[PDB]
Amino acid sequence: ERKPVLVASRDLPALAVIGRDDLSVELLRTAPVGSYDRPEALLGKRVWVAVPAGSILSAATLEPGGPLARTIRPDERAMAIAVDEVVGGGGFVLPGDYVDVMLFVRDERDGESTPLAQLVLPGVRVLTYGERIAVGSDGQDRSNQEKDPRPPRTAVLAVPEDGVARLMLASQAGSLRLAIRSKDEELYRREQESAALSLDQLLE
Amino acid sequence: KPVLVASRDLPALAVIGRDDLSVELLRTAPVGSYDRPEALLGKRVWVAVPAGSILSAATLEPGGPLARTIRPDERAMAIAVDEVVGGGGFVLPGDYVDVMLFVRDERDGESTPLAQLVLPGVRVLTYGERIAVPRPPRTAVLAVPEDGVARLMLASQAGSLRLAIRSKDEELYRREQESAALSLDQLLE
Amino acid sequence: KPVLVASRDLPALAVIGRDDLSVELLRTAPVGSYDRPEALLGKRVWVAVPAGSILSAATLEPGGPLARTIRPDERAMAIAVDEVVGGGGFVLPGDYVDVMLFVRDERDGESTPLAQLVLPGVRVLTYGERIAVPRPPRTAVLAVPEDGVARLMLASQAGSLRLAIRSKDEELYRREQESAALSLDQLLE
């Protein structure tokens, strides 16, 4: 009726080895899939991600992976770009948003310089903005809560495999900016189931 | 000590009733846990929650505020602002502005100043640290039509931008909720 | 006072029993000496110890931690990282990464920026001050295949490097336990 489930009695850091002092036993009505019944099954194993106090010990916590790798899919990658207030919508971008990446470059191919602007990546989910991170299928938030809030300097995006190179070029060949997309498009729900413009065309 | 637990499997994008939740007494309560059942009644889970799991961080809406103030045919983008650029520090969110550009052409080996209007009637979504649904402002976020994002990027990076404020008596919010380039030759002579 | 000495000639790479040891009481005990016989039972001497010698520092493993985390067909190399390179400080040891390179290649008298994937699926052994055998991180150690070592070195010095994290659902750790470059012309078209 009331099954035993093992939980953490203290704040286990990342890359820690479990002893008998860290574990505790509790009696519940339902045992989650992935839980353990006796302390001897978990002794000597390594937790590969931080476990807050009181958390139910799970099998997936004892496998190689990081906070970023637990919030993506096998057909995506996670890469970071340098951001400021102008690039990131005045500091109003939070994880879960969908953005378009715009590039400004000054080509120097045929002995002459030409400013240009293009759209490189449409509809990209934002995983981290600053010290805040998204929530994966595990239902756990792993945002670094620290005092003295410094302005954000980096953001991590979920990029398809074919575009990881295209972003990298755009990050170093010129300047980047982010354009936010509307919430009424429901790109989040749907995922749970261009010609370059020159100054000659702009100036009449 | 009290902690909420999922009694059955809750699928993605599902509302919460009293049958779904249970209360269990644990020695330590994790960060993010909820005590009374009424605190999670009517809310929606955004990831799948297997049975018996402690409920936390799955009831938080993914997204930001800027995405809640535009329409599917618009985008939100930010530009750099100073006191000269935006209305002497008298521009507030909820206004309508025209974007003007000054650039030096640099074609055919002769430089030529120019001035031109790039985007008319754009709605201001944020002025510095001010949003609607003692430090000088540094940026402003506007709601651009989907065909004008590249134009604004090119204008912002190629030259200098200024904002011209439009009148309140034009009723540009009701209509929402239903040329050429001047050169120094034309000005001087 | 009590000090442990050897009773017979102990050859290299030999385990220690109760017959090989003796206890002698000396006025001064040198640094590195062991007081009780059970402190050295089961340990191994890594250099030859002649008879009557005071036992110290011959019972210490020669080696470091990194060499215990790789296989005969792999090597360990360090690369320089910042927050942009290493995913905003959310990369831990045990993760798998792809290495991407940006270089400005010059063979014709004209410079052409390029981007390319150098190494796919590389385990991360150490992130700064973190190992599985404050101050911002500066280096990260990777387990490279033996044929790719040189390929990393060039990429580390000829241009800029970035890391792309792979998903946990791919299950590359269980697997371990048993293209063309893109130029600015392709992007701007």
Author numbering:
A (entry chain B): 54 to 246, 258 to 268
B (entry chain C), C (entry chain A): 56 to 188, 202 to 246, 258 to 268
Quote the original article.
The Tad (Tight adherence) pilus is a bacterial appendage implicated in virulence, cell-cell aggregation, and biofilm formation. Our analyses reveal that RcpC forms a dodecameric periplasmic complex, anchored to the inner membrane by a transmembrane helix, and interacting with the outer membrane secretin RcpA. Collectively, these data demonstrate that RcpC forms the Tad pilus alignment complex, which provides a conduit across the periplasm for the Tad pilus filament to access the extracellular milieu. A structural model of RcpC, combined with transmembrane domain analysis of its primary sequence, predicted that RcpC is comprised of an N-terminal TM helix, followed by two folded domains (D1 and D2) and a C-terminal β-hairpin that localize in the periplasm.
Further processing of the dataset, including imposing 6-fold symmetry, yielded a 2.5 Å resolution Coulomb potential map of the RcpCΔN dodecamer. Using this map, we were able to build an atomic model of RcpC33-303 containing twelve copies of RcpC. From this model, we determined that the RcpC dodecamer has a diameter of ~15 nm, and possesses a ~5 nm pore at its centre. Remarkably, the Tad pilus filament has previously been reported to have a diameter of ~4.5 nm, indicating that it is could transit through the RcpC pore. Interestingly, the D1 domains are arranged into six dimers, whereby each domain only interacts with one other D1 domain, whereas the D2 domains are structured as a dodecameric ring with C12 symmetry. Accordingly, RcpC adopts two distinct conformations in this structure, which differ in the relative position between D1 and D2, explaining why the overall symmetry of the complex is C6. Although present within the sample, there is no density for the C-terminal β-hairpin domain, which we could not resolve in spite of extensive 3D classification and masking strategies. The overall structure of RcpC demonstrates that individual subunits are twisted around the central pore with the D1 domain of each subunit primarily forming contacts with the D2 domain of the neighboring RcpC subunit. Additionally, L3 forms molecular contacts with the D2 domain of the adjacent RcpC molecule. These interactions lead to a very extensive interface between RcpC subunits, measuring ~2400 Å2 within dimers and ~1930 Å2 between dimers, which collectively are comprised of four distinct interfaces.
